[PDB]
């Protein structure tokens, strides 16, 4: 995260760390039930970079605060049972449908530091996914286009689709939204390397619940003027999400 600040203890209890058993931080992820994690497909599979992670290559770490300490009595580390990538994920061109589900080997237990985020309903999505409304991104990724000691947080405004489109050469899909301040705004912030797969969440003003609207997906550099971070559009892919849990867990 660039230009963010340290998270408060238990501020983002659905925040998950995708950890490679070299033992390294792959990406964030989010807890949506006691057995299901949501992340970016590219965190697992990106053939251009020769990245194709399997169930047995990874570990999921939940309830974490610190990036590197093993937080004895606080975090829980699970083994994956199965990985599901969106059948139409487009890794060949624009990371369209950049989403995967990981089903844990065993249901995790909730605690002050571990709690699932909600998935939006069409109507939550309809009223919140508006240009200028702010969401929150979290992660342990780079601080600069080094690495934080604790979880970072940044609040960012959703930007109008045209503005998104006109900032890049990549073709933008209905499955993506972009967020960030405009050069004029004199407020910065962005996700950065290592933040991928983390949650873009918003707090509903109707029921005071936190909803995960986006997934950290792609961008070009970190916190560049006139550029914006791009996120997977969770609601547009919710059908696929339900389909898998239902058809399998």
């Amino acid at each position: 995260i660039v230009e963010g600040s340290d998270a408060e203890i238990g501020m983002s209890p659905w925040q998950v760390m995708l950890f490679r058993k070299p033992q390294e931080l792959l990406c964030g992820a989010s807890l949506i039930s006691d057995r299901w994690v949501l992340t970016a497909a590219h965190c697992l599979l990106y053939p251009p970079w020769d990245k194709n992670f399997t169930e047995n290559d990874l570990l999921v770490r939940i309830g974490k605060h610190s990036r590197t300490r093993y937080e004895r009595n606080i975090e829980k580390i699970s083994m994956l049972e199965k990985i599901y990538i969106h059948p139409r994920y487009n890794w060949r061109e624009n990371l369209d449908r950049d989403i995967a589900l990981m089903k844990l080997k065993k249901p995790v237990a909730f605690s002050d530091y571990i709690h699932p985020v909600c998935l939006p309903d069409r109507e939550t999505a309809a009223s919140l996914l508006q240009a200028g409304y702010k969401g929150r991104v979290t992660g342990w990724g780079n601080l600069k286009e080094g690495q934080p000691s604790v979880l970072q947080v940044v609040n960012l405004p959703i930007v109008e689709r045209p503005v998104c489109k006109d900032s890049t050469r990549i073709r933008i899909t209905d499955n993506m939204f972009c967020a960030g301040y405009k050069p004029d705004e004199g407020k910065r912030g962005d996700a950065c390397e290592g933040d991928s797969g983390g949650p873009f969440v918003m707090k509903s003003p109707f029921n005071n619940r936190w909803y995960q609207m986006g997934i950290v997906s792609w961008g070009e550099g970190c916190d560049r003027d006139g550029k914006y971070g791009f996120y997977t559009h969770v609601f547009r892919l919710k059908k696929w999400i339900q389909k898998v849990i239902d058809q399998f867990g």
Binding site: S5, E8, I9, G10, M11, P13, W14, I32, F110, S111, D112, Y113, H115, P116, V117, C118, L119, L128, G132, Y133, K134, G135, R136, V153, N155, P157, M202, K203, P205, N208, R209, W210, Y211
Partner: peptide
């Protein structure tokens, strides 16, 4: 069910230090 209600904030009626910035934008 209990989704998105944080044990240390919502469940205790405490606010995190920047959540008003979100609500204020809506």
């Amino acid at each position: 069910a209990d989704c998105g209600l944080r044990p240390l904030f919502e469940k205790k009626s405490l606010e995190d230090k920047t959540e008003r910035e979100l609500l204020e934008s809506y």
